[PDB]
Every structure is written in structure tokens, then in C-alpha cells.
Design a protein around this motif. Structure first.
Motif, PDB file in Angstrom:
ATOM      1  N   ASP A 206       0.880  -1.618  -0.036  1.00 58.70           N
ATOM      2  CA  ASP A 206      -0.563  -0.019  -0.050  1.00 58.70           C
ATOM      3  C   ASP A 206       0.233   1.300  -0.257  1.00 58.70           C
ATOM      4  O   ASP A 206       0.164   2.357  -0.001  1.00 58.70           O
ATOM      5  N   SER A 207       2.419   0.995   0.347  1.00 60.92           N
ATOM      6  CA  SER A 207       3.067   1.795   0.371  1.00 60.92           C
ATOM      7  C   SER A 207       3.986   2.619  -0.939  1.00 60.92           C
ATOM      8  O   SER A 207       4.999   3.689  -1.343  1.00 60.92           O
ATOM      9  N   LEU A 208       3.591   1.160  -2.225  1.00 60.71           N
ATOM     10  CA  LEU A 208       4.303   1.179  -3.349  1.00 60.71           C
ATOM     11  C   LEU A 208       3.931   2.621  -3.622  1.00 60.71           C
ATOM     12  O   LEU A 208       2.669   3.601  -3.850  1.00 60.71           O
ATOM     13  N   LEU A 209       4.702   4.096  -4.452  1.00 62.29           N
ATOM     14  CA  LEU A 209       4.912   4.528  -5.443  1.00 62.29           C
ATOM     15  C   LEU A 209       4.669   4.436  -6.648  1.00 62.29           C
ATOM     16  O   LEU A 209       5.705   4.298  -7.053  1.00 62.29           O
ATOM     17  N   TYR A 210       3.763   5.071  -7.673  1.00 68.85           N
ATOM     18  CA  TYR A 210       3.530   5.222  -9.027  1.00 68.85           C
ATOM     19  C   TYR A 210       4.215   3.911  -9.618  1.00 68.85           C
ATOM     20  O   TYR A 210       4.222   3.740 -10.806  1.00 68.85           O
ATOM     21  N   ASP A 211       3.741   2.741  -9.146  1.00 67.05           N
ATOM     22  CA  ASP A 211       3.677   1.303  -9.401  1.00 67.05           C
ATOM     23  C   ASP A 211       3.658   1.078 -10.531  1.00 67.05           C
ATOM     24  O   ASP A 211       3.683   0.696 -11.355  1.00 67.05           O
ATOM     25  N   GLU A 212       1.677   1.265 -10.957  1.00 71.32           N
ATOM     26  CA  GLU A 212       0.862   1.564 -12.070  1.00 71.32           C
ATOM     27  C   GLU A 212       1.745   2.155 -13.514  1.00 71.32           C
ATOM     28  O   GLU A 212       2.156   0.904 -14.345  1.00 71.32           O
ATOM     29  N   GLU A 213       2.227   2.948 -13.065  1.00 71.25           N
ATOM     30  CA  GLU A 213       3.767   3.848 -14.229  1.00 71.25           C
ATOM     31  C   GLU A 213       4.289   2.570 -14.068  1.00 71.25           C
ATOM     32  O   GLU A 213       4.623   2.536 -15.130  1.00 71.25           O
ATOM     33  N   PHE A 214       5.535   2.247 -13.203  1.00 74.55           N
ATOM     34  CA  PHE A 214       6.930   1.912 -13.335  1.00 74.55           C
ATOM     35  C   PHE A 214       6.444   0.341 -13.869  1.00 74.55           C
ATOM     36  O   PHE A 214       7.090  -0.459 -15.074  1.00 74.55           O
ATOM     37  N   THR A 215       5.534  -0.250 -13.992  1.00 72.81           N
ATOM     38  CA  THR A 215       4.879  -2.035 -14.413  1.00 72.81           C
ATOM     39  C   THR A 215       4.684  -1.650 -15.721  1.00 72.81           C
ATOM     40  O   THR A 215       4.984  -2.770 -16.644  1.00 72.81           O
ATOM     41  N   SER A 216       3.897  -0.634 -16.259  1.00 69.36           N
ATOM     42  CA  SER A 216       3.686  -0.854 -17.402  1.00 69.36           C
ATOM     43  C   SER A 216       4.977  -0.442 -18.310  1.00 69.36           C
ATOM     44  O   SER A 216       5.290  -1.402 -19.661  1.00 69.36           O
ATOM     45  N   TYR A 217       6.140   0.243 -18.169  1.00 67.99           N
ATOM     46  CA  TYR A 217       7.464  -0.037 -18.592  1.00 67.99           C
ATOM     47  C   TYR A 217       8.077  -1.558 -18.779  1.00 67.99           C
ATOM     48  O   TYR A 217       8.480  -1.911 -19.643  1.00 67.99           O
ATOM     49  N   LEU A 218       7.708  -2.317 -18.081  1.00 72.36           N
ATOM     50  CA  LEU A 218       8.025  -3.602 -18.113  1.00 72.36           C
ATOM     51  C   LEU A 218       7.249  -4.139 -19.050  1.00 72.36           C
ATOM     52  O   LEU A 218       8.063  -5.289 -20.010  1.00 72.36           O
ATOM     53  N   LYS A 219       6.229  -3.900 -19.721  1.00 71.84           N
ATOM     54  CA  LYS A 219       5.594  -4.392 -20.706  1.00 71.84           C
ATOM     55  C   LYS A 219       6.227  -3.835 -22.313  1.00 71.84           C
ATOM     56  O   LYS A 219       5.961  -4.455 -23.245  1.00 71.84           O
ATOM     57  N   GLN A 220       6.300  -2.839 -22.064  1.00 69.49           N
ATOM     58  CA  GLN A 220       6.495  -1.692 -23.497  1.00 69.49           C
ATOM     59  C   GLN A 220       8.277  -2.562 -24.054  1.00 69.49           C
ATOM     60  O   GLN A 220       8.135  -1.821 -24.522  1.00 69.49           O
ATOM     61  N   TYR A 221       9.257  -1.829 -22.599  1.00 68.80           N
ATOM     62  CA  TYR A 221      10.879  -2.096 -23.312  1.00 68.80           C
ATOM     63  C   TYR A 221      11.170  -3.192 -22.579  1.00 68.80           C
ATOM     64  O   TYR A 221      11.953  -2.540 -21.693  1.00 68.80           O
ATOM     65  N   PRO A 222      10.880  -4.129 -22.564  1.00 71.68           N
ATOM     66  CA  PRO A 222      10.624  -5.794 -21.885  1.00 71.68           C
ATOM     67  C   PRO A 222      12.788  -5.842 -22.125  1.00 71.68           C
ATOM     68  O   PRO A 222      13.058  -6.058 -21.357  1.00 71.68           O
ATOM     69  N   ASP A 223      12.856  -4.589 -22.914  1.00 68.75           N
ATOM     70  CA  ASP A 223      14.671  -5.208 -23.336  1.00 68.75           C
ATOM     71  C   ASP A 223      15.291  -3.780 -22.346  1.00 68.75           C
ATOM     72  O   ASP A 223      16.518  -3.504 -22.518  1.00 68.75           O
ATOM     73  N   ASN A 224      14.916  -3.106 -21.781  1.00 68.93           N
ATOM     74  CA  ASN A 224      15.609  -1.576 -21.931  1.00 68.93           C
ATOM     75  C   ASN A 224      15.050  -0.858 -20.398  1.00 68.93           C
ATOM     76  O   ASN A 224      15.560  -0.173 -20.401  1.00 68.93           O
ATOM     77  N   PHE A 225      14.353  -1.695 -19.805  1.00 62.01           N
ATOM     78  CA  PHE A 225      14.090  -1.404 -18.793  1.00 62.01           C
ATOM     79  C   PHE A 225      14.018  -2.479 -17.444  1.00 62.01           C
ATOM     80  O   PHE A 225      13.412  -3.868 -17.659  1.00 62.01           O
ATOM     81  N   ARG A 226      14.289  -2.483 -16.507  1.00 62.36           N
ATOM     82  CA  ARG A 226      14.337  -3.471 -14.936  1.00 62.36           C
ATOM     83  C   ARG A 226      13.419  -3.221 -14.008  1.00 62.36           C
ATOM     84  O   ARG A 226      13.765  -1.735 -13.788  1.00 62.36           O
TER      85      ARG A 226
END
Ligand code: FAD
Length: 307
Positions: A206-226
Motif C-alpha cells: 500500500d506504500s508503493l508509489l507510481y507502481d502502475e506507471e513503472f510496471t507498464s514500462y516493463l511490458k513496453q520496453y522489456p529489453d531496456n527496463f528492469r
């Protein structure tokens, strides 16, 4: 019709040096609050709010800088004097959350005082600026100074560089701005093709900040973001950010040896644990952390902004 969002105005890319101290404490710029929203759920240990401020294009900045806010009132101990400035890392890119170069955003944790013994709150001891900020409403005015800071400016000379970002709590702020610039915005003169890796330590889910945004980059740039998270009260000794770094220590070391930049931002308390972990990791590999660190500092790969 591509995936990157159009941003304007592109003349914000023309400046050769970052703006610094455009407005000073004696004559702040009066900005207007556009919105304030809580970023956390019910179980978070305390509220963290996201604030969007309209500076109307008069207080431009670069990613990684901070705005100073002077809360209203008199200095508790400087009769007739204004409250001191409090600094907040800017959490948006230079174009801001509305992609138009008129707004900037802050990620602010409310500093609340509780009597340790009686657990009783005492509002007269709460932090002044943070509560004033999270209590603001649309249309309220804020006195801004800055921008300030050069330590956390993003090195863009190599668009294929590696950036390992380690945050705890509100320390995620500058990284939200780096990542939107690397992945979300259509910035013609900065096309990122490297690796960005974000480690985020928080109390719980419940204390995660902007999790949805960061999670989304995982699906769009799987080769450039961890992206790796550590929840200190809900994970696998409990879980801190240093533990995750330990988990991936070989990769990290390999990346640092190859020139990666590494950044730490958030509460100063996070540093000792991390430094202990890195020394232990180095030792296992048969390396001297001290010598490695001196080298990373010499090469300008080590970036820390903790408070
Ligand atoms: C470069 C930089 C970047 C920063 N970025 C961020 C960011 O992105 N987000 C963020 O949330 N913060 C950030 N900070 C911290 C921020 O600047 C403020 O320090 C923080 O918000 C608290 O300021 P405040 O005015 O709420 O508390 P203050 O009013 O300054 O109080 C400080 C603390 O003292 C406690 N206290 C006050 N009076 C008493 C008393 N009488 N007895 C006991 N305890 C007392 C208060 O509860 C509070 O915890 C940053 C700081 C720096 C230097």
C-alpha cells in the motif's frame, strides 16, 4: 500515431545549462496548485501525496533538480522572518504531467509527530511544509524558489548508457522524471536505448508509489527496463533494498565495471545498510569495495541525494 507522447514546447531542449536559482527566497515566484492526490492505500504507515503545480512556464527546470517551497507563517524562532525553504525533488520531467511545459509535480510525505510513549499525535509538532503541501487544494497559491541542484542531473551524453536507480520512499521522485523522459515522451534529441533499472524500497504494498506507471514500462520496453521492489513489512531478516541488490550482485557489479551510473535518493538512513551490503558482496568476489568506490567516484558514476 506512435507510442511516445508528444510534448511541447521543444525549445525547452535548447538550453545548454540547467536553470539554477531563478527565484530566490526574498522574492519567490507565486505558483498555483492544480491538483493534490494521495498516492498510497489505507495500510501505508503515512500519507504521501502527489502535487501538481502550475508555474506557467516561468520556473523551468531539468530532470533531477529540486524546487524550494516556503510555507506561509513566521520562522518559529526568527521573529518577523519568513519560514525557511524546504527542498523537494521534482517528480515530473521538464514538460510536466500535462506535457506542456507549464507544470511541475512533487511527491511529498506528511511528517506527522506521535508521542513515542503514548503514541499520541501532537499537531503542534507535525512538519510544517509537508502538511501544508498535502493539505493544499486546487487554486491555492505556493511560494516557489529554485530550481536548485546539479547532483542528480541525468548524464545524456551517451543515450545507450546504463542507469541503476535505487530509491526508498519519496526518493523515487527524480526517477519518475528520468523514466518518463527515457520511455514515455517524444523527445527527438534524446532517444534512449540503454538499460534503466529501478530498485524501490517501501514499507508495504500500500506504500508503493507510481507502481502502475513503472510496471507498464516493463511490458513496453522489456529489453531496456528492469524493476525490483522490496517491501520491508511484507517480504522475504525482512526485506530492504540492499537485499535486492544483493540478489543481483553479479549483474550489478558487471554493469558498474562497464561504466553504469548508479544513483541513490531518499532517506539518508538507507545508506549504511547499502554500503554494508556492497562491501560484503565485494569481499565475496575477492574485491575491495573501498577501491571500487574510489574508482566509481573518480569516474563520476556515483550519484547520491539523500536527506
Ligand atoms: C534535496 C532534498 C530533496 C528532498 N526531497 C523531498 C521529496 O521529494 N519529498 C519529501 O517528502 N521530502 C523531501 N525532502 C525533505 C523536505 O525538504 C522536508 O525536510 C520534509 O518535507 C519535512 O519538512 P516539514 O517542513 O514538513 O518539517 P519541519 O517542520 O521542518 O519539521 C522537521 C521534523 O521535525 C519534527 N518536529 C517538528 N517540531 C518538533 C518538535 N517540537 N519536537 C519534535 N519533533 C518535532 C517534525 O514532525 C518533522 O518530522 C527533501 C530534502 C532535500 C534536502
Amino acid at each position: 500515431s506512435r507510442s511516445k507522447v508528444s510534448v511541447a514546447p521543444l525549445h525547452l531542449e535548447s538550453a545548454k545549462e540547467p536553470p539554477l536559482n531563478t527565484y530566490k527566497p526574498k522574492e519567490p515566484f507565486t505558483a498555483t496548485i492544480v491538483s493534490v492526490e494521495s498516492l498510497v492505500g489505507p495500510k501505508a504507515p503515512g500519507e504521501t501525496c502527489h502535487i501538481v503545480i502550475d508555474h506557467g512556464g516561468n520556473v523551468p527546470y531539468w530532470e533531477g533538480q529540486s524546487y524550494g517551497v516556503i510555507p506561509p507563517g513566521e520562522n518559529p524562532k526568527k521573529p518577523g522572518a519568513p519560514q525557511n525553504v524546504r527542498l523537494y525533488s521534482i517528480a515530473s520531467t521538464r514538460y510536466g504531467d500535462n506535457f506542456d511545459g507549464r507544470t511541475g509535480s512533487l511527491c511529498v510525505r506528511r511528517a506527522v509527530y506521535y508521542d513515542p510513549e503514548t503514541g499520541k499525535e501532537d499537531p503542534s509538532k507535525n512538519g510544517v511544509c509537508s502538511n501544508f503541501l498535502c493539505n493544499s487544494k486546487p487554486g491555492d497559491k505556493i511560494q516557489l524558489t529554485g530550481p536548485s541542484g546539479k547532483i542528480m542531473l541525468l548524464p545524456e551524453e551517451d543515450p545507450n548508457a546504463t542507469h541503476i536507480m535505487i530509491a526508498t520512499g519519496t526518493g523515487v521522485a527524480p526517477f519518475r522524471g528520468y523514466l518518463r523522459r527515457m520511455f514515455m515522451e517524444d523527445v527527438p534529441n534524446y532517444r534512449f536505448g540503454g538499460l534503466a533499472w529501478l530498485f524501490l524500497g517501501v514499507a508495504n504494498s500500500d506504500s508503493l508509489l507510481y507502481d502502475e506507471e513503472f510496471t507498464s514500462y516493463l511490458k513496453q520496453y522489456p529489453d531496456n527496463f528492469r524493476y525490483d521492489k522490496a517491501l520491508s513489512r511484507e517480504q522475504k531478516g525482512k526485506m530492504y533494498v540492499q537485499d535486492k541488490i544483493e540478489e543481483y550482485s553479479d549483474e550489478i557489479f558487471k554493469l558498474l565495471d562497464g561504466g553504469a551510473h548508479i544513483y541513490f535518493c531518499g532517506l539518508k538512513g538507507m545508506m549504511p545498510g547499502i554500503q554494508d551490503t556492497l562491501k560484503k558482496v565485494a569481499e565475496r568476489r575477492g574485491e575491495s569495495w573501498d577501491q571500487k568506490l574510489a574508482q566509481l567516484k573518480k569516474n563520476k558514476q556515483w550519484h547520491v541525494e539523500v536527506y
